[PDB]
Amino acid sequence: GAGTEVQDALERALPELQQALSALKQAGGARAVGAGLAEVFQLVEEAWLLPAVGREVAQGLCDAIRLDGGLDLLLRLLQAPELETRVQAARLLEQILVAENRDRVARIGLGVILNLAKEREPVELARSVAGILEHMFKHSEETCQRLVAAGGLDAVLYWCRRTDPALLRHCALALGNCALHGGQAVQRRMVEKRAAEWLFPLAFSKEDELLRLHACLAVAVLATNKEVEREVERSGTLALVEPLVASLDPGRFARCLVDASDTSQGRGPDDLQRLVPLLDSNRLEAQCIGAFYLCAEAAIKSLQGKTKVFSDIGAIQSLKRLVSYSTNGTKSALAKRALRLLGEEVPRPILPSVPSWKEAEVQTWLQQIGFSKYCESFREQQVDGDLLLRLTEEELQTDLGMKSGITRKRFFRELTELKTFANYSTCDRSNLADWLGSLDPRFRQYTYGLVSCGLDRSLLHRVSEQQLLEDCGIHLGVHRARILTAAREMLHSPLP
Amino acid sequence: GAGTEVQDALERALPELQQALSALKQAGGARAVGAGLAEVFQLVEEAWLLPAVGREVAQGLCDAIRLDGGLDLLLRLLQAPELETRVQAARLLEQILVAENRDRVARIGLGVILNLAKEREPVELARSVAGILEHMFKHSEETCQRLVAAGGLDAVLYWCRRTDPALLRHCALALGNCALHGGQAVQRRMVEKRAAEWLFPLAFSKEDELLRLHACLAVAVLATNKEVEREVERSGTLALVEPLVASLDPGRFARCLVDASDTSQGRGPDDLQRLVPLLDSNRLEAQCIGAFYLCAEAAIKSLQGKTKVFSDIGAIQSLKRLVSYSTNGTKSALAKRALRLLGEEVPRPILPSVPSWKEAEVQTWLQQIGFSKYCESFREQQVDGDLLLRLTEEELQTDLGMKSGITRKRFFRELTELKTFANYSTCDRSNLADWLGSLDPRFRQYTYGLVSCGLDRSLLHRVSEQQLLEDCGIHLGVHRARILTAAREMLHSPLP
Amino acid sequence: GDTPDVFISYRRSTGNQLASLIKVLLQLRGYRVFIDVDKLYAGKFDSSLLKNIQAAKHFILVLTPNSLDRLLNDDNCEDWVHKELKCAFEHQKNIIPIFDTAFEFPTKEDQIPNDIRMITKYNGVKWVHDYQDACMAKVVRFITGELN
Ligand SMILES: NC(=O)c1ccc[n+]([C@@H]2O[C@H](COP(=O)([O-])OP(=O)(O)OC[C@H]3O[C@@H](n4cnc5c(N)ncnc54)[C@H](O)[C@@H]3O)[C@@H](O)[C@H]2O)c1
Ligand SMILES: NC(=O)c1ccc[n+]([C@@H]2O[C@H](COP(=O)([O-])OP(=O)(O)OC[C@H]3O[C@@H](n4cnc5c(N)ncnc54)[C@H](O)[C@@H]3O)[C@@H](O)[C@H]2O)c1
C-alpha cells in the first residue's frame, strides 16, 4: 500500500522540520528567524507540491507545527516590528491553515490577524494576510462574524482596488468563502458593504479565468440569498456570470490533476454540499455556476473513482431537475455533462405543453421526478396531461395508490413546478397565466384551474372566494385572498 | 479491601479525638479551651488532608464530634466573651459542617451563627464565620430563607469589600451556594440586595482563578432565573463570565486530584444535578460556565471510573444539544471535550440552512436529537428539509409511525428548537424571521410557515386569524392573536 | 443615555481590586461607570478605550503601589496608563486621582512625562480601607467637578 511511502516521506520531512523549528525556538534576531522561517516555509511548500499525495505529508507538517512550538511563535513573529519577520511569518502561516490550525487561531490570537489587516500597504504582507483571511473565513459562522465586525472584511474589500494577481485571487476566494460560511447575518453585511460592486473588477478581469470564476461564485452565492438579491442585481456583477460560465471548460481541473489517485485537487463533502443549493436556486446565474463547479468536481471524482458522494449530497436529483425544466443551453450542457461523467442516465427535456400531453408524456415525467414506482398506476388509470393538471388529493390517494400523505405532499411539490413551467397556449385565451404570475410567481400554477372553469381576465372580477376554492382548486386561503383582491382592483380594465 | 485501612486510621484518630474532646468538657478557662480546640482542629484538619481517603476519616471525626459533646459545646464557646475562644471554636466548626452537622446546627442555635455575623471586624473570626455561612447556605431552602431574612446574607455582602483571600473565597462560595439552594424567594432578595454588583470585584480579581470562577458561577446561576435576569445583566458582571471560562482548563481539577481512587475532589449527584439547568438555560454565560464545571467533573469522574452518573443526571443529551445548536466556540470546545472524557460519540454541529437540507441531513438530525428509532420511517418516506419544516401532527402519526401523542409532543419540542435556530435566507425575502423574533423569540419558529404561504412584511397586515391557523400552521391562539395584532399596528410602514 | 458618567483608569497589575471596588460603589450610587476589563491574555491594545475616555464626563485614576512605574521615562507614550491620563488631560476632563493608603507619587518628577506630570499637583482622595463609604462620599464631592 502506497500509504507506507507517505510515512517514509513524513519520516524524511519531519526531522528536517524539527531542525528548522528548533532553529526558530531561540530568539536569534531578524536574520536568524528570517532564515528559520524560510526553511520551514520551503519544507511545507515542498510538501504541498509533492505528486506523491503531498496534501497528506503537508497536513502532517501542519500537525507537527501545531503540536510543537505551535502557531504561537508564528503569532508572536507575526507582530514583531521587523517587516521581514512579519512577511516570513505570514507567508508560512498562509501555507499551513489546515482545519485544526484554523481551529487553533480562531481561539488564540485571532486579534493579531485583524491587527495585520490594517497593514494594507506592503504587498508581500498583503498577499499573505489576504490568504490568511481567506482561510479564516472558511472556519465557522462565528469566525466570520468576528472578522466582519472588525476590519477583516474591510481589508479584502480595500485590496480589491489593487492590481496584484495573488492578492486579488485571495480576495476573490475570501469573499466567496465568507459568503459560503458566514451565514445570513454576514451576507447582509457584505452586501451593505458593497461587496457585489467590489467583485465587479475581479469578474471583469482579463488575464486570469480563475480570478473571474472565483469572483462569479461569490456573487452567485450572494444572489441565492433572497433578501440581498435585489442589491446584488443592482451591482450589475451578475450579468458577467453566464457569459463567463459559457466560455470555460469543466474538464480543465481534471487535467490539471494527474492520473491514478492524485488528490492534489477535489472538494470534500462539506465543500461540495454548499454548491448544491446553487442548483436549487431560482437564479439562472447561480444554477449556471453551480452546475459548472459541480461538473468540474464530477470530472475529478469520476477519475478518482469517488462518485458515491454525489448520490447522498443529493446532487443527482438536482442536476436531473436542471435538465428536465431547462430553458437555457449553458446550464443544460453543464448539467447533462455532469450526469454523463457520473454515469447516470440523462433525462430528455420535458415538453412544456402539459395540457396536450398524452399517457406517454405522463409516464416520462413520472420517471424523471423519481415517482417511477407509480408509473403502473398512472398507466392503468390512463392519466394524461389534462387529468394530471387536475389531480386532487383524493384521486391521488384512492385511485393511484399513493397512501402516504408525505408522499402526496412531495408529488404536489413536483406537480407544482410542472404547472409553473407549463405552456398554456391551447387553453388560456386571455393570458391569465401572466396575470397570475405578475402578482406572484407562485400563483402561475393556478392557471389551468382558472381557465378550465372558464374564467378569464374579463370575468375574474366577479369570481368569489368559494369559487376559487371549490371550482378552481386554490387550497391556500392566503392565495385565494390575494388573487381575489387583485381581481377586484383590476375592474378599471374590464369596465371599458 | 482498602476500607479496612480507613478503619485503622479511624481507630487511631478517634481515641486522640476523645482525649482532645474530653479536654474541652471541663470549663478549663481561655488558655485550656484554646489548646483543646487547637487539638481537635489539628486532628480534623489532618483527617481532611489524608491522601488515604481523608474525607471518610474526617466524616467519622465529624460524626464523633456530633455524637459526643455535640456541636453544643462548640456553639457555647462560639459565644463566650474571649475572642481567642470564639476564633478557635469558629475555626473548628467551619472544618466540620458535614451534612448531618449542618442538619443539627440548622435546628439548634442557628441564631448564634447569625449573632457572630455581626462581629464583622476580626479577620480570623470573619474567615471562619464566612466559611460557616457558606456551609449553612448549602443546607436547605428554609435555612437560606432564615439566613437571608436576618443579617446572614448582609455579612457576606459586606465582606466582599474586604481584601482577605480566604474571606473572599468563602464569600464567593457562600453567594453561589445561596443562589443554588435558596430557591426563587431568596434569589430575588440577593439581586435586590445588589449581590450581582458585589460579585463584580471577586470576578474581576487577579491573583486567584478560583475566586473569579466561583464568583462567575454565582452570577450565572442568578442569570438563569428569568425574573432577575435583567438586573444581573445591569450589574455588568455577566460580561466577565465567558472571557474567564475561555481562559481556564477543565483538566486542572482532575490533576489537583491524584490517581487511583482519590476522592478528595468531585461533586456528588445532588451537586452535579444543579449544574445541568445551566446547560439548559438560554444564557450564553450560564451555558459556558455550566459546560466548564461539568467538563471538570467529567475529567474527575472518568479518572475515578464513575461515569454512570452523567447518564441519569441527564447531562449527556444536554451536552449533545449544546454541541448540535452551537454558535459559540468556547461553549462548544467544553461540551465536546466533556463528551469525549465521558466516552460518548460527539455530534457534528448541524447545518443551519434547514430549508435546503436533503434526506441525509434529516437522518443526521434525527440521530442527534435521539429520535434514531424513527430514522427508517423518515428515510422511506423521503423526508427532506422542506418536508420536515412542514410536518403536521397527522403526518407524524400516520405516515411516519409516531403513534404516541407524548412522543409527538417531544418531537415537536425538538423541531421547534431547529425551526428557531434555522437560517431562512433562501426563503425569506422580507426578513420576516426577525420581525417575528422581535415580538417574541419563540415566534421566530413560525417563519417558514408564513413565507411558504407567500406572506411577507408588506402583505402581513392583511392576514386573518383563520389564515394564520390554517395556512401558516400557528396552532396556539395566543400566538395567532399577538402576531395578528402586531401586523395591524405595523400598517404605518406598508402604507408609504 | 448610553454614555458613561465616569471612566476608571487603573494599572493592570496592582490596581484592579480598588478599581473594581470604586466601580461598584459608584454604580450603586447610580453613576454609569466604565472600566476597560483589559486584564486578560489578549490585553495588548485597544485605542477605543481612549474614545471611552472622550465619552465620559469624569476620569478616575486609581493610584496604587508600583502603579506609575511604566510612566517613568515613557517619552514615547507606550504605556496605556500614560495614554489614558494623557487623553483625559487633552480633552480637559474632570480628573480625580484616588490614592491607595500606601501610594505616593515618584520623587523622579522629571522622569514623569511632560504631557501628564501635572497629575502630581492635582487634588485627590486618600482611600482608607476601613472608611470606604466616607472615602466614596469624598470622591462624590470631586464628581461635582474640579477642573484644576
Ligand atoms: N489543501 C491543499 O491541498 C493545500 C495546497 C497548498 C497549500 N495549502 C495550504 O494549507 C492550508 C490548508 O489548505 P486549505 O485551506 O485549502 O484546506 P481546506 O481544509 O480548507 O480544504 C482542503 C481541501 O482538501 C480536502 N481534503 C480532504 N482530506 C484532506 C486532508 N487529509 N488534508 C487536506 N485536505 C484534505 C478538503 O475536503 C478540501 O476540499 C492553507 O493555509 C493553504 O494555503 C493547502
Ligand atoms: N468535603 C470535604 O472533602 C472537605 C474537605 C476539607 C474540609 N471539609 C470541611 O468539612 C465540612 C464538610 O465539607 P463540605 O461542606 O464540603 O461537605 P458537603 O457534603 O457539602 O460536600 C462534600 C462533597 O463530597 C461529596 N461526598 C460524597 N460522599 C461523601 C462523604 N462520605 N463524606 C464527605 N463528602 C462526601 C459530596 O457529594 C460533595 O460533593 C465543611 O465544614 C468543610 O469546611 C470538608
Numbering used by the authors:
A (entry chain A), B (entry chain B): 56 to 551
C (entry chain K): 705 to 852
Reproduce text from the manuscript describing this model.
Wallerian axonal degeneration is strictly reliant on the NADase activity of SARM1. It is therefore intriguing that the endogenous ortholog TIR-1 does not support WD in C. elegans, despite its demonstrated NADase activity and overall high sequence similarity to SARM1. We find that a series of interlinked molecular alterations in SARM kinetic properties, the order and strength of oligomerization, auto-inhibition, and regulation by nicotine nucleotides set the two orthologs functionally apart. In conclusion, our investigation into the absence of WD in C. elegans has revealed that while hSARM1 ectopic expression in C. elegans neurons leads to axon degeneration following nerve injury, the ceTIR-1 does not.
To assess the activity of assembled C. elegans TIR domains on a stable SAM scaffold, we designed a chimeric protein with human ARM and SAM domains and a C. elegans TIR (h26ERL … DTP562-ce709DVF … QQR872), simply designated henceforth as “CHIMERA”. CHIMERA was expressed and purified in the same way as hSARM1 and ceTIR-1, with similar yields. The structure was refined to 2.7-Å resolution and allowed a better resolution of the ceTIR-1 TIR domain than that reconstructed in the intact ceTIR-1 structure. Apparently, the high level of sequence similarity between ceTIR-1 and hSARM1 at the TIR interacting interface with ARM allows the C. elegans TIR to fit and dock well with the hSARM1 ARM. Like hSARM1, CHIMERA showed a significant increase in NADase activity in response to NMN supplementation, indicating for a TIR release from ARM inhibition following NMN binding to the ARM allosteric site. NADase kinetic measurements of CHIMERA found that it has a 3-fold higher Kcat than ceTIR-1. This is consistent with the better SAM oligomerization scaffold in CHIMERA that elevates the local concentration of enzymatically active TIR sites. Nevertheless, forced oligomerization of the ceTIR-1 TIR domains in CHIMERA and the constitutively active mutant CHIMERAFP255–6RR demonstrate that even when fully oligomerized and not inhibited, the NADase activity of the ceTIR-1 TIR domains is intrinsically weaker than that of hSARM1 both in vitro and in cell culture.
